[PDB]
Amino acid sequence: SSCSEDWVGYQRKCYFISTVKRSWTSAQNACSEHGATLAVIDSEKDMNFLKRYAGREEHWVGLKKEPGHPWKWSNGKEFNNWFNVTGSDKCVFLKNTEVSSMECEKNLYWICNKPYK
Amino acid sequence: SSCSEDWVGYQRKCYFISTVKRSWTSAQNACSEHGATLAVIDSEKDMNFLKRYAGREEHWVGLKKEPGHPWKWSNGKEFNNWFNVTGSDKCVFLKNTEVSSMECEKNLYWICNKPYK
Numbered sequence A, B: 001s002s003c004s005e006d007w008v009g010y011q012r013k014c015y016f017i018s019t020v021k022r023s024w025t026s027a028q029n030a031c032s033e034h035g036a037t038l039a040v041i042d043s044e045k046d047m048n049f050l051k052r053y054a055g056r057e058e059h060w061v062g063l064k065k066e067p068g069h070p071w072k073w074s075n076g077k078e079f080n081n082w083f084n085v086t087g088s089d090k091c092v093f094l095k096n097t098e099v100s101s102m103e104c105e106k107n108l109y110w111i112c113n114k115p116y117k
Helices: A024-032 A044-054 B024-032 B044-054
Strands: A008-010 A013-017 A059-064 A091-095 A098-102 A109-115 B008-010 B013-017 B059-064 B091-095 B098-102 B109-115
Touching: A008 A044, A013 A044, A024 A059, A024 A109, A044 A091, A044 A098, A044 A109, A044 B044, B008 B044, B013 B044, B024 B059, B024 B109, B044 B059, B044 B091, B044 B098, B044 B109
Parallel strands: A059 A109, B059 B109
Antiparallel strands: A008 A013, A008 B008, A013 A109, A059 A091, A091 A098, B008 B013, B013 B109, B059 B091, B091 B098
16 A cells, blocks of 8 residues: 555645644654654645645644745755745645645644655 | 546545536446446545535435335436435435535536546
8 A cells, every 4th residue: 555544645635634733843753653744745636635635734844944035845845935934924724725835833733745655 | 546637535535526517427428438427426435525526516426216216316226325315305405504415407516426546
């Protein structure tokens, strides 16, 4: 099986959606304990699936920026800005209707992803 | 690997969500053209995933009953009634907030599934 039990496989990545809310950093730490990271979004398909999978509630995904620095993925890779992040905060979240920023310390559900096995 | 390109894998089933609306029957045939069937739901996990994946819009799933007979799955097998179908129609649909019945002739988006490869 390309993905573990309880994980969702789509476009060569395995996704997990949280059942509890935590800070961005805590969510990132939770994801890392399962070989994953806060959701990295490589394409329009990933984005549409994620907004939909997320649903009405806001969910932390793997994009955040340090003061005076470009957005960086949760796994370190550079962001090519193929999509726009609204708001003026430094951590990115999304839901079925938007992709925006929020204060990183806010407790939100989250979504992790990692490559297929 | 477990599911083909553009399908979503979860709890051993591959899912596909429509881009257009159609009658329940037309939906079943479309699913059929891809070796699948209108979404069979065997557990609360399956249901919770389908409802959120479906989103705000109503989507047809694999339950239909012919007057005089009991509900049956899109693939012909018997329904164990582990859950209750509300409303008063012969075709089941679902969305992020509910799962009920509706006139089979209505044109709704749909969701198919099939077993892992």
